[PDB]
Paper text:
The I4 clade leads to mature antibodies [name].2 and [name].3. Inspection of the theta and phi angles indicated [name].3 had predominantly shifted its rotation about the epitope. The most notable mutation in [name].3 was the light chain Y27S reversion. A clear shift in the position of the N301-glycan was observed relative to the I4 intermediate. Consistent with the observed rotation of the bound antibody in the I5/Env complex relative to the UCA+G57R/Env complex, the Y27S reversion resulted in [name].3 occupying an orientation matching UCA+G57R. A cluster of mutations, including an improbable VH G110Y mutation, occurs in and around the [name].3 LCDR3, near the contact between a loop adjacent to the V3 GDIK motif and the N301-glycan GlcNac base. Additional mutations, F93S, A94T, G95N, and S97A, result in remodeling of the N301-glycan interaction, shifting the position of the LCDR1 Y32 side chain for interaction with the first N301-GlcNac and interaction of N95 with the second N301-GlcNac. In addition to the angular shift and LCDR3-related mutations, a G103S mutation in HCDR3 adds a hydrogen bond with the N332-glycan GlcNac-2 N-acetyl moiety. While [name].3 acquires several mutations critical for neutralization, including G110Y and S94A, the selection of the Y27S reversion may have limited its breadth. The greater breadth of the [name].2 antibody compared to [name].3 is likely a combined effect of improvement in the N332-glycan interaction in [name].2 and the Y27S reversion in [name].3.
The [name]-1 Env is a trimer of gp120-gp41 heterodimers that are heavily shielded from the host immune systems by N-linked glycosylation and further protected from neutralization by conformational masking and considerable sequence variability. A glycosylated region near the base of the third variable loop (V3) of [name]-1 Env forms a supersite of vulnerability that is targeted by antibodies originating from diverse germline genes in multiple [name]-1 infected individuals. Here, we determine structures of antibodies in complex with [name]-1 Envelope for all observed members and ancestral states of the broadly neutralizing [name]-1 V3-glycan targeting [name] antibody clonal B cell lineage. Here we used cryo-EM to visualize the interactions of a complete inferred [name] clonal tree with the co-evolving virus Env.
Numbering used by the authors:
A (entry chain L), B (entry chain G), C (entry chain B): 520 to 547, 569 to 662
D (entry chain A): 32 to 139, 150 to 185, 185A, 185B, 186 to 309, 312 to 321, 321C, 322 to 354, ...
E (entry chain K): 194 to 244
Write the structure that this text describes.
Amino acid sequence: LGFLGAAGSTMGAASMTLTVQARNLLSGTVWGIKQLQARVLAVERYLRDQQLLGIWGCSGKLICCTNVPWNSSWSNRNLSEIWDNMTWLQWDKEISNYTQIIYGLLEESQNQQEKNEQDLLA
Amino acid sequence: LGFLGAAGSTMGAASMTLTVQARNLLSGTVWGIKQLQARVLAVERYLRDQQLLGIWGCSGKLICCTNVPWNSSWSNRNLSEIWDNMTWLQWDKEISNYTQIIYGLLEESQNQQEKNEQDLLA
Amino acid sequence: LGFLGAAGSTMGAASMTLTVQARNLLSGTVWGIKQLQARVLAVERYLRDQQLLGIWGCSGKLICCTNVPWNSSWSNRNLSEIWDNMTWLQWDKEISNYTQIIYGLLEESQNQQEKNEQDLLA
Amino acid sequence: ENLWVTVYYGVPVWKEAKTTLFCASDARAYEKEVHNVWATHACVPTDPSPQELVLGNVTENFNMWKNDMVDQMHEDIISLWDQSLKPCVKLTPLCVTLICSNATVKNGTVEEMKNCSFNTTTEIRDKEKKEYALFYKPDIVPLSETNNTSEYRLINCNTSACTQACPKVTFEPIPIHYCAPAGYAILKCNDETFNGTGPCSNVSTVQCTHGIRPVVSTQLLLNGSLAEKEIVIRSENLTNNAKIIIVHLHTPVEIVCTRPNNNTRKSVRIGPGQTFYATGDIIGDIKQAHCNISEEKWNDTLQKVGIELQKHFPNKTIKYNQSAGGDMEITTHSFNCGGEFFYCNTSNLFNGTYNGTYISTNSSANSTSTITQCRIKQIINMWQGVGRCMYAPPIAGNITCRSNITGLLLTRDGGTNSNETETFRPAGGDMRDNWRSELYKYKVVKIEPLGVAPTRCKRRV
Amino acid sequence: INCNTSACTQACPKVTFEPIPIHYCAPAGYAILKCNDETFNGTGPCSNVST
Ligand SMILES: *[C@@H]1O[C@H](CO)[C@@H](O[C@@H]2O[C@H](CO)[C@@H](O[C@@H]3O[C@H](CO)[C@@H](O)[C@H](O[C@H]4O[C@H](CO)[C@@H](O)[C@H](O)[C@@H]4O[C@H]4O[C@H](CO)[C@@H](O)[C@H](O)[C@@H]4O)[C@@H]3O)[C@H](O)[C@H]2NC(C)=O)[C@H](O)[C@H]1NC(C)=O
Ligand SMILES: *[C@@H]1O[C@H](CO)[C@@H](O[C@@H]2O[C@H](CO)[C@@H](O[C@@H]3O[C@H](CO)[C@@H](O)[C@H](O)[C@@H]3O)[C@H](O)[C@H]2NC(C)=O)[C@H](O)[C@H]1NC(C)=O
């Protein structure tokens, strides 16, 4: 499907076959020290993204159902129309305000939920 | 058991205690720019291999059970023969043709299989 | 809470909110060759520690329950005393002898236990 | 109790360990040109955020002297300066016989600068033309045992060759923040009454160090940081009298210098496509370079030091004595100001004898009283075996050097006849000791996120 | 004409000038897009784009 075979496509098409866009984080060859700084590449980006994605309990490079409650004050467009009509390359621009709050909510929920696991077999 | 304590050994012995061969991707220290290139190490090899191994659903550096059907047209040597007698260092030489097809089958099955969890939870 | 908001704190406080000390392995930017040498960072430290933490079956940057038995000859201070009173910054100094044995026990138990997955779904 | 051992990730445990640190400078320097100032070039833009945070319940040992972070500072700054003197002209045609006048002034109330001349390589390598230049006296030496008194030598070609400093780089010290990589952390000691060793009973995690000023010095500690509440005196062991005792000061003492001579720069073209700069005629009258201090404030400060040196040798009273002597580079206070290098004979500041009692400043006989002489050199062997030469080009106009004293470097002197007035001296020393006076608060540690404790979970297959 | 402003260097005969093509090319994680509308005035939206 290519590196960007879903940009500007609907949610259903772009959410299936996410792997084609996930795998293209491997490259690089020698052009000296300035190029070797360019090898932060996957070595830093992939590790940052995977650290975030694992801290939220989602150790998987695909769709992962977290539990944090989506809210009235963050959505304001009808639920049903998003998953059929719209593309990511405008959804990110609607939602871009509340990334940081969500990025803490998901990890504090994980720290909460694994604790109950620690008791539920103790 | 050492870095290669199962090369040319039977499959049963070589498939148990895989850890001794997995851990030795940590070494390397300074000798100029060429050495700093030389330390691709885990930093590229392990990230690559683990990205493949996780995209197929096997987030574990050991034996993992995938579902893709082994086929008549890929095997042609008796099933019971291989696991008791043969070694990896001659099995990879017979299976070397069909790596690329399996490497896509394993991930498309994973994407196919996580979906049924997404909707069942819904 | 800050990078070290539990140094010299009790087990209860220091074991909840482990994430704050786990995230900060992301920094560094250009100064000559020695900087890019200095970027072992996550690129080596996190990969090492995560390889150990996954080889033992604990693929998660938080509390994980292993099965290896605590022993009379390693503890010798009252069990109930530790989890309410002491800090990590004096516990690691009392346990520092037996790290290497535990680091093999935890992986050989993992290899022992994932084997039964092969039988229990074959 | 058949408890199952677990593993935790994110454990707060320290290990004191070695590492490099990033040199980082403030934001305003980074609109400027390359090497202007050098801190914009070889050091990263900084960020004060986040705020330093206290570690509420802790007890951690610090050892100022055993620290090696200062050695990383030292090596990095030397390597930084060495790279700064590659793209400039390596003089060379000026290490020739210099014909110089011998009229002499001879009448006193004056100390002057010698006038010299030399032949130069212009835009034709098979032609030489006549030039003249004013040179400060130390930079020039008699040529030969053959006593032609007019033939003088530039001080080079006996040990090394030299490089002119480019005008596009200036010496004013931009602040620097020596800063940690992730996975390491910088811990700061918050006890003000800290003897330099033992436990700091209050410690804080810090993003990285507050601004260090790498001001060059040899006998006194110029612009810097001052003590919280009083004088604090530090040394590894007073048993060995040969080690350098460092004194911090609470109240500042002010120092101001001046080069009242009005030097003028003379441009000389030396080799193809590269210029050498010298000193031309001096406008106005000839005068002496000097530095001033207020003597009642200096006397008070010295007495306050005296009540802190008497603490460790109670039966023996205090006497401050003149410098070691011998080499000029050791027995003089030297520093940098306005790009020029001063060399002061400083026996005047450190003659006295203190006796525990407080001889006060009040009533003031004359509030305008002061204690006041320095030489100037262009050929500078600034560190030993570093590529020693730097030829500091002349600057136009005149300069002033109003500054603050914040500490002393001293020698405790051995006994003599068991005298009650056993003495102390000013002491030159390494530049590492200069920077050790300002990084004492800090140590480096390595974080160990993985640790094991007994849970009560059992495990499933 | 030299020596009034700078010194000079002879070009080595082992290197010659004629321009070989170059493909300035992306790192992984980044991507290069290409504007496929020929009637393009240097700004505004490219209504046809290709990765
Ligand atoms: C360091 O030493 C160097 C020498 O090693 C000094 O440099 C010399 O400086 C002098 C003075 O400037 C300079 O001599 C003058 O050069 C002028 C070039 O234009 C000449 O025109 C001038 O000639 C007049 O003065 C002579 C006496 O010096 C007279 O003999 C002569 O006839 C001229 O006088 C007539 O013309 C003037 C014109 O104004 C007129 O007013 C008179 O009435 C009369 O009609 C000088 O010769 C040297 O050339 C310099 N040497 C070099 C090598 O450059 C330098 O000054 C010293 N440094 C210091 C700080 O003192
Ligand atoms: C170079 O030297 C000249 C002259 O020696 C310096 O000029 C003098 O600078 C001082 C300040 O340092 C001026 O003093 C002024 O005095 C008045 C008195 O009423 C006061 O109102 C001001 O606050 C200020 O202090 C002085 O006027 C000025 N000129 C002279 C002839 O003294 C010059 O500053 C020196 N430059 C450098 C870079 O060193």
